[PDB]
């Protein structure tokens, strides 16, 4: 067997920003204590993976990216108790150590063991399990799912239902859970409310799904790409608007359409200007705006704090506010019981070897989620 | 009798920015339909009144300022049903019309009839009840309490307990209710939590009172004036820190003191820089920061939205989040029932004729609240 041995396999290595991935052989070390080595089955292309390529997100290079995925445990290191070889699993790019002050807090989920705030591109122990051309290669968010095999810390993996369709439930590893939780858990959308969702990609569609599940009466989708509107309406948008169609700024348009401002707004793009526009369009006394989009590295927004003094609430969240290891298995169980749908998010399927075509589809505006199969 | 007649009385007129009040005779018209004329008994000096003088707040001049006050109804216009001549009352600088979407919302209090967002300096009907030297004089926030008599709209006055000591409960008209509500209602401070309060004036002390009432374990007061610390500890601060004493930025100091960030922070000054510092010092995953201080007119702050993406909540509020006409009588009843103290806020009691000396005490750092007695 492969247990305890280096695995040679193919991965998509990013050597340089603004370049295609290189599909080539890597060496994947065996798992150390409290680590898990996973044979990947499916991985989604999230815009955050593209942010690594574009330098919107800064993480050390060279790197194996990928964070939205599902696979099967190949082997476990010493002392692992929560998964076994042959288990279906979803890697957790937001870990859940269960021990830090955030993991112990009833409403926190941004575990202090994350590799997001101050990215090292390593395992928890500060080292890498990947070699390529004899060179160490960085991890990404402790997951590195753009590889036939990855190694993750135990706090960065959840066991899921053995009957799970991995080519669908990989989306619970990022885009679905993030958008759905941003609506239902972070914003706490109320029955009969009016919501505005800026950005109608996979995450924004999942926000719409959550707003509809919460009983919103109106869900206004906002996108500069009108090709996104049909699917947004299919999953619950009641109106869609394209800011490019209007002479006035879209915050003014949305305030007029909502007879004085929306109850809940969501920024699901990653632009400083739309973060401020989304805040402005929620009602000034009781509105809530949630930032979901990832902003460009190290850039600050400018805003008038009178927008908050009148009573608005502004918040953001990682991974929909979900405590990742507790929540992922429950979300898979709910998917299996048909409590929500994932197919509306999946527009394209490709083999892993066609990863660059999958990124081209995202960048052209044509796809929502492309799922890559190993 | 005065009812139905013009009253000539003394008031403090502000003819231009950055000049002393002029204490002189004005004419006060009788109340029209749905208006109430009040003989003032006591009014507090709030920093927001000083903001009118300093140009921090823009409102039409000339003006009779004052918004934190209590008095006795002299007469009512046709159609008034909520107060009668002889009633003790507190003017409401945030009205409660009861009809607008904000008044009908369970968590809104910034009634759309307010004169804050787009100040007109008038009664609801767009006219003034004040003349001085033959010139019309603007109202301020529908209240204009720096006058022996004022006229307010019915939606801008609350009837209070007939046995109320007006030289104390005038503080329920602004500073106490604002700070206390910002803690208990807006932030929803939890038992055992750690709070940081930036600014230890009358409003910040009231925030501390609310944090202590909510059962906070630690309440860290922050002020550049160490003379403010003794009273802050008297009303519940467990520690006080002066940013000037430190080589590091105070957000770093407060993060260290709180072993990774506070649960709740409050900006109770009115500076863009301390609004961002207060947000930063709350724990990145689950912290809450409330803006209470009034920012300088038309100035934007700069901030990194990653502070929110990790999970922080940022909000602001007017008047502690309290629906004004519902809440003010209950707060007075609570004071009468010894549920909270007001004396710790009152450092000076002066005749109304010494209004300018009262403002000088505030500006010098020497007072918390001066109460002016008519
Ligand atoms: N907070 C989290 O945990 C988290 C998780 C997953 C994704 N993200 C971020 O969320 C964002 C969306 O991800 P995704 O859905 O995969 O991306 P996506 O598929 O690229 O969708 C973004 C959408 O925004 C639209 N858009 C671009 N500019 C504008 C504009 N000015 N106004 C309106 N619409 C515009 C665009 O046409 C597209 O449909 C990205 O920034 C991700 O990095 C955050
Ligand atoms: N949101 C509302 O409804 C509302 C109500 C009442 C007051 N306010 C505002 O709240 C603020 C405080 O009012 P107040 O308590 O009457 O004022 P105040 O009595 O002038 O108190 C302000 C305190 O801030 C301190 N301070 C000044 N600069 C700094 C600094 N850099 N760091 C730390 N401390 C500093 C100062 O020494 C003083 O003790 C003002 O901006 C008011 O306009 C808002
Ligand atoms: O898509 C999820 C996602 C994020 F929300 C980030 F904030 C981030 F930095 C990142 F790398 C990521 F993958
Ligand atoms: O002190 C209360 C108070 C405020 F909170 C304001 F925002 C404002 F503009 C104002 F005039 C005022 F008096
Ligand atoms: Zn993602
Ligand atoms: Zn943790
Ligand atoms: Zn109203
Ligand atoms: Zn005030």
Curated annotation (Swiss-Prot), chains A, B:
Residue positions binding NAD(+): 48, 199-204, 223, 228, 292-294, 319, 369
Documented EC number(s): 1.1.1.1
Coiled-coil annotated spans: none
Post-translational modification N-acetylserine, affected residues: 1
GO molecular function, one term: all-trans-retinol dehydrogenase (NAD+) activity
Cofactor: how bound: Binds 2 Zn(2+) ions per subunit.
GO biological process: retinoic acid metabolic process; retinol metabolic process
Family: Belongs to the zinc-containing alcohol dehydrogenase family. Class-I subfamily.
Protein name, as recorded: Alcohol dehydrogenase E chain
């Amino acid at each position: 067997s492969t247990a305890g041995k280096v695995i040679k396999c193919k991965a998509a290595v990013l050597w340089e920003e603004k370049k295609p991935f290189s599909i080539e052989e890597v060496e994947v070390a065996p798992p150390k204590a409290h680590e898990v080595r996973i044979k990947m089955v499916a991985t989604g292309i999230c815009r955050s993976d593209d942010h690594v390529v574009s330098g919107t997100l800064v993480t050390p290079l060279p790197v194996i990216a990928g964070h939205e995925a599902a696979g099967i445990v190949e082997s476990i290191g010493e002392g692992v108790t929560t998964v076994r070889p042959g288990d279906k699993v979803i890697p957790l790019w937001t870990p859940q150590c269960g021990k830090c002050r955030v993991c112990k807090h009833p409403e926190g989920n941004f575990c202090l063991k994350n590799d997001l705030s101050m990215p090292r591109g390593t395992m928890q122990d500060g080292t890498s399990r990947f070699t390529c051309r004899g060179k160490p290669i960085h991890h990404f968010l402790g997951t590195s799912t753009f590889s036939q095999y990855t190694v993750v810390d135990e706090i960065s993996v959840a066991k899921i239902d053995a009957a799970s369709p991995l080519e669908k439930v990989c989306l619970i590893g990022c885009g679905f859970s993030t958008g759905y939780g941003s609506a239902v858990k972070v914003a706490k959308v109320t029955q009969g409310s009016t919501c505005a969702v800026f950005g109608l990609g996979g995450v924004g569609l999942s926000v719409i799904m959550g707003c509809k599940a919460a009983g919103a009466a109106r869900i206004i989708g906002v996108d500069i790409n009108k090709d996104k509107f049909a699917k947004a309406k299919e999953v619950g948008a009641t109106e869609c608007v394209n800011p490019q169609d209007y002479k006035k700024p879209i915050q003014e348009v949305l305030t007029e359409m909502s007879n004085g401002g929306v109850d809940f707004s969501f920024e699901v793009i990653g632009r400083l200007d739309t973060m401020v526009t989304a805040l402005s369009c929620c009602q000034e006394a009781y509105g809530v705006s949630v930032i979901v989009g990832v902003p460009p590295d190290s850039q600050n927004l400018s805003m008038n704090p009178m927008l908050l003094l009148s009573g608005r609430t502004w918040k953001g969240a990682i991974f929909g506010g979900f405590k990742s290891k507790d929540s992922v298995p429950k979300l898979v169980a709910d998917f299996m019981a048909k409590k929500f749908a994932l197919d509306p998010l999946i527009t394209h399927v490709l083999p892993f070897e066609k990863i660059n075509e999958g990124f081209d589809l995202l960048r052209s505006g044509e796809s929502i989620r492309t799922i890559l199969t190993f």
